Design a protein around this ligand. Sequence first.
Ligand SMILES: C[S@@+](CC[C@H](N)C(=O)[O-])C[C@H]1O[C@@H](n2cnc3c(N)ncnc32)[C@H](O)[C@@H]1O
Ligand SMILES: C[S@@+](CC[C@H](N)C(=O)[O-])C[C@H]1O[C@@H](n2cnc3c(N)ncnc32)[C@H](O)[C@@H]1O
Ligand SMILES: C[S@@+](CC[C@H](N)C(=O)[O-])C[C@H]1O[C@@H](n2cnc3c(N)ncnc32)[C@H](O)[C@@H]1O
Ligand SMILES: C[S@@+](CC[C@H](N)C(=O)[O-])C[C@H]1O[C@@H](n2cnc3c(N)ncnc32)[C@H](O)[C@@H]1O
Ligand SMILES: [K+]
Ligand SMILES: [K+]
Ligand SMILES: [K+]
Ligand SMILES: [K+]
Ligand SMILES: [Mg+2]
Ligand SMILES: [Mg+2]
Ligand SMILES: [Mg+2]
Ligand SMILES: [Mg+2]
Ligand SMILES: [Mg+2]
Ligand SMILES: [Mg+2]
Ligand SMILES: [Mg+2]
Ligand SMILES: [Mg+2]
Lengths: 383, 383, 383, 383
Amino acid sequence: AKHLFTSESVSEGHPDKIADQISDAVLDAILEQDPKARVACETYVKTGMVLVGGEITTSAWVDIEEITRNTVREIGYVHSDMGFDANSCAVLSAIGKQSPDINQGVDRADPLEQGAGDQGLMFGYATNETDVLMPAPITYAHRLVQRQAEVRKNGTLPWLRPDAKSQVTFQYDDGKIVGIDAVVLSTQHSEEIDQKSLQEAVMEEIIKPILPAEWLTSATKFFINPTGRFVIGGPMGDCGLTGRKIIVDTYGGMARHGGGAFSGKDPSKVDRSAAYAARYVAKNIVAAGLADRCEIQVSYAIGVAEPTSIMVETFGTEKVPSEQLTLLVREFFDLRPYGLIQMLDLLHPIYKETAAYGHFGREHFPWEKTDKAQLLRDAAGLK
Amino acid sequence: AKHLFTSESVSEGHPDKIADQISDAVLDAILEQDPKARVACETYVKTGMVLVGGEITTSAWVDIEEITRNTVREIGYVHSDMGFDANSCAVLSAIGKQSPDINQGVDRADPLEQGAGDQGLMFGYATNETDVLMPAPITYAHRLVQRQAEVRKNGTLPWLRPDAKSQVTFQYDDGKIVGIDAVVLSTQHSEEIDQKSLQEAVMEEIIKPILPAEWLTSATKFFINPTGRFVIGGPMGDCGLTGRKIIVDTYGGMARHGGGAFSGKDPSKVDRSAAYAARYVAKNIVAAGLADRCEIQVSYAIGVAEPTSIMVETFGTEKVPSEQLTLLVREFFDLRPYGLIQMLDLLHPIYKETAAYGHFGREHFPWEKTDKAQLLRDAAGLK
Amino acid sequence: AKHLFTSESVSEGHPDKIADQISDAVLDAILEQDPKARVACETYVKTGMVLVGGEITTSAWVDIEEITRNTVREIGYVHSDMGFDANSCAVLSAIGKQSPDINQGVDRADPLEQGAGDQGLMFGYATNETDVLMPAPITYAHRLVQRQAEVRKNGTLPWLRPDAKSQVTFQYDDGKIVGIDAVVLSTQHSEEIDQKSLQEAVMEEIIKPILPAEWLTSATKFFINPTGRFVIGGPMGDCGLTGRKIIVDTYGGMARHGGGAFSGKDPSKVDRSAAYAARYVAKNIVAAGLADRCEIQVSYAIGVAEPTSIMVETFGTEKVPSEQLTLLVREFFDLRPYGLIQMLDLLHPIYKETAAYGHFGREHFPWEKTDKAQLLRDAAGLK
Amino acid sequence: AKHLFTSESVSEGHPDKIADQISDAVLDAILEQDPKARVACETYVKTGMVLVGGEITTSAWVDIEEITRNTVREIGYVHSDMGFDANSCAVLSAIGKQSPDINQGVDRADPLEQGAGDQGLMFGYATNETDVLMPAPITYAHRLVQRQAEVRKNGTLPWLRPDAKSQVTFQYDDGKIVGIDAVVLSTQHSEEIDQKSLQEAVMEEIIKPILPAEWLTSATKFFINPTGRFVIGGPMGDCGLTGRKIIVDTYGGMARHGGGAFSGKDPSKVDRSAAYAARYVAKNIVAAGLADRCEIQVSYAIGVAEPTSIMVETFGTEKVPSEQLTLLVREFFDLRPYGLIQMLDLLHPIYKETAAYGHFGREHFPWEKTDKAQLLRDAAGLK
Ligand SMILES: C[S@@+](CC[C@H](N)C(=O)[O-])C[C@H]1O[C@@H](n2cnc3c(N)ncnc32)[C@H](O)[C@@H]1O
Ligand SMILES: C[S@@+](CC[C@H](N)C(=O)[O-])C[C@H]1O[C@@H](n2cnc3c(N)ncnc32)[C@H](O)[C@@H]1O
Ligand SMILES: C[S@@+](CC[C@H](N)C(=O)[O-])C[C@H]1O[C@@H](n2cnc3c(N)ncnc32)[C@H](O)[C@@H]1O
Ligand SMILES: C[S@@+](CC[C@H](N)C(=O)[O-])C[C@H]1O[C@@H](n2cnc3c(N)ncnc32)[C@H](O)[C@@H]1O
Ligand SMILES: [K+]
Ligand SMILES: [K+]
Ligand SMILES: [K+]
Ligand SMILES: [K+]
Ligand SMILES: [Mg+2]
Ligand SMILES: [Mg+2]
Ligand SMILES: [Mg+2]
Ligand SMILES: [Mg+2]
Ligand SMILES: [Mg+2]
Ligand SMILES: [Mg+2]
Ligand SMILES: [Mg+2]
Ligand SMILES: [Mg+2]
């Protein structure tokens, strides 16, 4: 009955995230100019530099330094005092074009037959634990780093620096949340404020306002800047890389994962598109009330348009025998490369925004919408 | 009852893996000279270069170019013909030292009290699906890319190139394997051989000898180099990065994951050490026969030595009420930073070997050993 | 009366020249699209990479990788066998925009008033030692490396590699050439041919056909691949950088030099335009017969249109008192930034061609033409 | 009789010089540990990075980041406010080992026979225009940038930034100096001070105290920060590269040059050692009173110990027929690779100090000493 589950999240000022933002910042710029572009951009970030590389084959014309400097700038690093500075950092580029060998298998004569960008498996997930049908732990962790960033930008706590990470562990009894045992919040700061003050301030401004007072009890344990000092952060304190936040980007470790990153790749890359499409049916199934929680999983083969595997897991919480529930899935949605792109209209520059604070949970994203639910209901005991 | 599950693996010639190998190749070298070194090494690999960076604080003296060139060389790329060459590629370095701010929370006066290298959560897993208590899908996928590499090196198929990826999906009925529906195998090759021949050869030499003939039926579907052409590969066709094989490195997507990569980090980094220790108790629990399959999860807080969370999931397959099963865990093993390192003796250069073909399944690894099982048995109905 | 003077040259396959070529290759491409572009391109070349950086502010849209790969390709390195490969090498870019602080001083309201791109001094030179009014030592050294490159491309000596350097020292008595004391010729080669053969072959194919048989006597000493082995070359054997061939680029050490490189910069950069204009008047003066040999020198001040200094040196060989000869100079030519560009029509992509084998001596270059001579004659005892 | 000659210099804060300093800073460190090390270190410096590369073969163990960060730190860039920061900039490394092919020709069995590091020609120079037998123009220009640097460090003009360049043109009549026509002084500054103030301040603190009041007349023209604004400088405003200050490093353009840079290379490199040895005999000749001014020139052939060419030019100012003056040269000094190093005791870390403000003119340098003069006198009309 009782058990503990822990999830974590990172601020937009976290090295790894900086990468993602940059990566997806480039794609957006590119896509704005050419929707059918093929972008596979990987970014490396350290002490005084930013490396934007990979393979890009587009007709668009973009400025990497500008997109980069501007992207970091917005993140927050604008002075050597914080360790990194959009204005004075180095911006390197090693961007080649996509291999034709791969391309022949992706873009074929007939657009519909067009194949998967690569082989691989993706996991979709949905749960009635919350309104947005997302697990609770990841939702609150995200809220924590997000708050910290907002209290920093609005000038509430001017001594806060971009870099920050958050961890929370919930108490789960009878399969439901009963509270929160431990809370972790690490945030970069200036040489001007003291630990205690900082700690005491983080509680009032960042934790207390975000964590439901009900789940907080005299038992909860708070871990704030444990090493006792976090003045050095960002790429200086930790190397940032693209696609190294795979889990916080998705469901916090509650659901499963195939190993494919999101940022830097255009929709023809199943790692991102098939993933989104998977959250789409999973969420839609639960909204449709066909199950309380279900994990979906598709797998593909490079240059091949038709999915190599599909499986729905409802953990017994289903309301219609999986059978019809699985035959309904391939019945209603098109998981073929050039079916999901139209299904969710992925040919637009809407990904940068997705690079920090979770790819799921934001109802305004095309894959968060639940329109097929009611119709997915009709296919089984409408009433 | 019936459902499909897919996993995947990559050859030691895959860009991402090249990174990991390099990353862990540097640490080993360093560790050989200094076991208590603090290594956080991230590698970026593309068309004609290799970028080794991150933060390293050691008293050891190593040669990055030599370790790198040699590491790639062994992988296989030794001619421009294959796209990359250990002898003629560029070797770049951006390696700083570890932030003292982090260090004060890690290495404290008392070695026992020494804290976790970072915050985060890790997932351990074990299953009686196989002798090594590893899931089957990931085990066979690894075997496929591994075979390909060996048939290449031994000269059986001299036209094979280092770069290769493998995907397999099993049929699961009644919770057990009944067969394999689809098989995917992509391998780089020379301009000298044709697709058909290649395909036909891959079956005889790499697939047929590795996949159990029982699970192969007239239904199984084989996908071999689908785009129809894979002559261009390695960093030229795809950017390689450290820690982007998170899932194939562990359990193939069968179990869960927290988001911590392994390669490039010394044991004081819970991402690698708490992870290993988690596979250790999970495996040891199943071996101890206390459960058919169980997932373990620990989470930590930077600078803090005592785990912030622990949870054992046996999916009902447990044989002793979880209660005593969870109280036994913290009873037998020490998950504190400086407890797992001694527990598994992680202060040695034994990681490079772990950078390709799974971190689990190799019984000779200290975390694969099951010595505590029988003793973990004594603590519950010995007999 | 008697004395020895030595000059040297380098093949288009030399690391430093590779840089130059690349640098000026980028400019041309840019200029083709925008003649008034401001290009300050510096290239770094090593083992498996090429670094193109600096500051560029243009409205043009160019592809660095393509321009670079193609430029190296043409030079000759196309296989790992030779140490570098246009197809498999890395291409990096760190190009920012020109500082507006400099720009306000360069481009002012009135185009004529437009100022010098930087401060500095430049040396022009001319001599009746040869038809093209160039010194002899530098002329023959260029010819040597140029021949080696041609005998390599035409397939005469297929085992020759791109990298090569040439050195010649002439005997000067009575102020004229009497012969050549020592000849140096170093060229990269394949593991297939032996030293002796190579040496013997270099004489017949490269040295004997280029050096006048009259100046070659039993005294002359030949130095061919002295270390006894030159199989390793190019960026692998030596780091290439832009603007490190300052002297072979001009007059071989016979005349003076101020320190400004040529490649990578647009004409608004006095280092290149004022230099060219200087060879222009010096050559024109000797052609006009006003002197047998004269060195010119101008100096500028950033943001300032009017030259800070001008001086003509005729080494006594003048035929009209220097006085009128110097008053004639500023009388006939316009050395103001926006006067020399029109004077020589420098807003065109004509520089790559100038990046190897000398910037002077090629009569088809705009600064090699002598049209003002006859008119420079009228201004002094026409007849 | 009358004519104008211009020279220039650059502060230790100039991008190019930053490179040199870095380059020679690495050598010294290495040499300190191993005098017979072979170092060919080329540095590239831009906006937020520093690239140290080339080929180094030593038994020494050094820290590039530390040597670099510290070297830049001392120069002065320590805040993003000035555009570059030693603490937060990137430090990259691409250092391979020296090609054995070259080595066999350099270090042979017999140490005496040991050969020249490369082919090439070098120019030495001396003049009685000044006590240190250096030309005047380059001496004063160096003094100008050197003053600016000192008035910045001592806090006299706290708003001064590291980057600065200086230009001076002298009036030469009857072959002697009569005065100075134009003065150029460009220095980077803070957003806090205005142009007029700055200009007025630069005259009092930097120009007036350094330029002889005799040579300054109502005619002299002063050019101070002409573009009207120099707030942006350093690698941000201009790319820094090693060996691009060839001329200011030596004689300001008064004497000739062969094209060989000094910084980053050990003494076995004739570009630096033969160069120094050339200033040594030229200076010593004039000190010996054998000529008022003389230019020396040697040339070498890779792997070859014996110089390929030697020539002394006294411009008629000699006092003993050149003949005996040239036979005296090879009589007194040893220009063989392994003769000059002992001659000047070059196996020591004494080069960093030589990377800013001229390689000649500092009488405490081993090549600035004149001990052979009196003995060079005995060999010709002692009395
Ligand atoms: C703990 S660091 C990685 C370990 C590090 N590379 C090392 O050398 O041990 C990972 C993240 O922790 C956070 N961090 C950095 N310094 C910290 C500190 N002093 N206290 C708490 N968190 C810190 C940052 O957001 C950083 O991305
Ligand atoms: C499909 S690629 C990544 C997509 C690519 N960056 C793009 O621009 O679309 C990922 C992996 O697939 C494999 N691969 C590369 N070229 C391939 C081809 N032509 N056919 C099959 N697999 C290929 C390699 O092992 C490579 O690391
Ligand atoms: C002699 S190397 C400079 C010294 C080198 N950086 C080192 O590590 O000693 C410079 C040039 O000499 C030429 N070179 C390289 N290897 C050579 C060899 N084995 N014999 C003759 N010339 C060679 C190339 O053109 C190369 O760019
Ligand atoms: C004029 S810049 C070279 C041209 C530049 N690459 C461009 O993009 O036009 C070279 C040097 O001039 C100096 N400098 C830079 N900005 C300056 C300014 N605004 N006024 C005067 N000197 C300046 C610095 O010492 C710098 O290294
Ligand atoms: K890292
Ligand atoms: K990639
Ligand atoms: K070099
Ligand atoms: K520059
Ligand atoms: Mg990371
Ligand atoms: Mg993938
Ligand atoms: Mg990858
Ligand atoms: Mg982590
Ligand atoms: Mg060079
Ligand atoms: Mg200059
Ligand atoms: Mg320069
Ligand atoms: Mg040279």
